[PDB]
Subunit: 293 residues, 4 copies
């Protein structure tokens, strides 16, 4: 009837290691991840995988060569583009700029809000593709990519990037009552046990987040949203298949790296949920950005 | 029975021009103020005076030579020191670092909170002395300072400073729900129609502000707080008398700058309230800082 | 295949960012923000002397600059340059030699990051320079076709616009540094020193090294062919601008320039436009050295 | 009054910030954050070679460094230097000549901000160097008296620590810059180039100018006398440290150094401690030139 991306089962407890808690050793991997993706934040996805640290270190080591490439840059960008395309076609997204002005937001402040949205509009596809690699590698045991056709695919990615500062994020333990209820609403509506970095950064401006989320919420899990989400997911799987450097990181690789059988089961649930989440997050950020046009 | 600083009458509307709204010309004055004070934010006191822009520009022009001096640095610093001294002596201020940890705050986060408190602990004395200059100059029509004394008083101040970026502040139009309630509580308790930059910056961590304000609130307008406040105000007055470069900015000077009689009356009420406010703010930040030791 | 240097008797008058007044600095900021780069090119500094033309040219060009199309066409020039220099030249790695000179791993990383700025940014300036020159010379209207709707989408968001890279300006320069600059000017046939070399000059012994290895490649047959190819890419980009660009001699008059000033501008932009195809190759060479 | 240069056979082995490993970098960071300065002095880079001693000495000195007393005593040294150079020399302004060389208002602003960094921080390094040296030479316990309780209060909090100043390192330098560096070494009797001159060297023509104006003042009678005075202030600051500092030869042994390594350290710190009184005067001179 319409394409619907099924949410996986996750009973595993999720234990993200935030940047402000990461020890020196973890922080160096975090630094490399941000420098390579060219983003100023470590994804909650990668924070959660990092709990299984030796797996995280090895999976990053193996994925990183592909992430440095022209191919990966383009594949990520094309997902941003597809999202923009879908949401523009399927939804009448009224602009919120006048409404924000009426609330008292100045031109500069709205500019700052846009800039925060741009960070995630750029970065999230990269996280989506990485999460997809981690999940599919664990589930299938397959070796992905490394076909090396067009030589330009292996060229270095477009070199510029913003890696500082970490965006201002209102963590759950920072948050007061009213903000906690918006977080609760987002969690329930999106079927997640965590608050994404994106929403926490928007929450630097609580009345903006309330507005932006309130306009998005009715679109969630409409047929068009759901079909679009499925499409974004398919794009991410297609990118995994075309990685310029082969990626393999199976259960046995996880065991080799020092995970137990039980941790590996747990990790599979954790990454599956994050991977599913990420196609939705891409569409959501696109919606926010188009609202603020 | 004990020294207490009378709150002036202000029925005039306060119209601060925030840094995110200031036009090009005002922003240049704002930049010079920050560079000269050595602080990363424009005070709400100076924002409110800036509404009367030709007065603000001429008053800053006349005060700036003094603010650049070794004297001003030392006099401001001595007010910080006096405040530290008074609050230490008069109150049993229990450390809140353990509670913050229990609430989920990391070592790095608590460090960031302290850094924010330091900005205001350093800068507020300077704003206090300036507001005192503006108020007394208008009320008295007197010429303050300019005495030949110790040549070293005219030397450049301690040269290092911190002027970027503007602290993250949760503006009233940013706030939602419970933060506005905390803001309401602060306004009513401190008898102010506005929220200070200091509390808007603490509000970056709403649960921290709630704790810090809760611990401070019972101290407000105890005899010891009030007597301390009076002493801080007295130091401010003494500093004005010893400015190394003479400052005069009377009603007549205000009229010559292009203010109307009615604007000058309004400005007098406005500055009087801020001047009064600032002795209290200094004690409050000291309290926060000692809590967070 | 060969790009002949144009004739330029006109004096070039860059307005550096550290001298630009408030109004001009606002246009400079917008340029940087849109291109997503931390520096104002000497190309745009020189055109800024003709301020009413500069402001209107930017006004007309900026809508295209903000697009996916522009991001991709600029990126494809960088890719092509990488491809050409890789195939056409044996470019020996210089990292070992840098280390032997006392450069640490972190310093070499810093040097690479400076190179990446220009590697990214120069194609954008090249296309803009091409737009200005051909607009003036031909009076034609370039681009503006609907075509693929995605071409008009906003470009890939993220950018680095601060700080301005540390540049050793000519009046900063001492004796031997002035001599490297003179050599560069002579060899490249330019009356000015590019931002690229000035930034490299923050590490004088590094600049000498890198320029040293590049210099014998300049104006070899393969370099010239490569340069011709890069120029052709810039012209193709201009023909496919998603938003129409027209800015003729007559438009220059309407913007506030006199006829004589327009004629001078034409000489100035022609020199810079020619220069930029070569700068792209040169930075690509530096970058491959530093691999 | 005169201040003799100590004998120093020892090789000085600074560990620069761009080479420091993770462990040392954390001490460097705490040093900068406590002093409130954006660079790690060469004094501390050299002592860092004796890392077990450096870590313990800093551990012992840091509680004093954090205080109101230390902020004031350091500041009073800056003031005294300002005072002395003002009285003892006719220092001609150089802003006009810099402008005439092509420096803009903003560039001269940037130059002044760099000088301010060292004007602020060098007295702190001087006092620390004096503590290390005298601790080792005398074996005494310095300070630790209660006295005025305000002396133990935390220092004026605000600080600029964030970007390391751009410094043209000796291996960055080529040609004529290496000559100016050699002149500085010979004139000041040092085997190294201070962070302050390396930062001024970001503008090579400015450094030549500023050094050229200072040089005839070096080791005149009024300069030597002022230097002696600055040294004596540092010694007084040490005697009044709010928290006791003891770090003897025996402490050096307990910290992990051998006896021979301690003998060498004593030579190294003695040379730096002597250098620092001179550096304070020099930066004061630069700063008054640039008014």
């Amino acid at each position: 009837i319409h394409l619907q991306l099924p949410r996986p089962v996750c009973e595993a407890i999720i234990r993200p290691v935030p940047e402000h808690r990461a020890d020196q050793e973890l922080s160096e991997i975090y630094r490399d991840l941000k420098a390579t993706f060219g983003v100023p934040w470590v994804g909650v996805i990668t924070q959660a995988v990092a709990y299984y640290r030796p797996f995280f270190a090895e999976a990053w080591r193996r994925f990183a060569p592909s992430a440095k490439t022209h191919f990966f840059e383009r594949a990520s960008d094309d997902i941003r583009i597809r999202s923009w395309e879908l949401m523009g076609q399927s939804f009448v997204i009224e602009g919120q700029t006048d409404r924000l002005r009426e609330m008292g937001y100045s031109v500069r402040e709205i500019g700052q809000i846009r800039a925060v949205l741009d960070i995630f509009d750029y970065g999230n596809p990269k996280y989506l593709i990485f999460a997809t690699a981690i999940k599919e590698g664990l589930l299938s045991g397959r070796t992905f990519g490394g076909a090396a056709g067009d030589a330009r695919c292996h060229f270095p990615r477009s070199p510029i990037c913003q890696i500082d500062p970490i965006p201002v994020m209102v963590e759950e333990h920072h948050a007061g009552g009213t903000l906690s209820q918006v977080y609760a609403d987002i969690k329930q509506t999106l079927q997640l046990p965590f608050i994404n970095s994106d929403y926490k950064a928007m929450a630097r401006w609580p009345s903006y987040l309330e507005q932006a989320w309130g306009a998005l919420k009715p679109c969630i899990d409409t047929p068009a949203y759901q079909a679009g989400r499925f499409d974004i997911n398919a794009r991410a799987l297609a990118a995994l298949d075309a990685l310029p450097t082969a990626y393999r990181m199976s259960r046995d690789d996880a065991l080799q790296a020092g995970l137990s059988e039980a941790q590996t089961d747990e990790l599979i649930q954790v990454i599956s949920l994050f991977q599913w989440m990420l196609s939705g997050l891409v569409l959501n950020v696109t919606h926010f950005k188009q609202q603020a046009l």
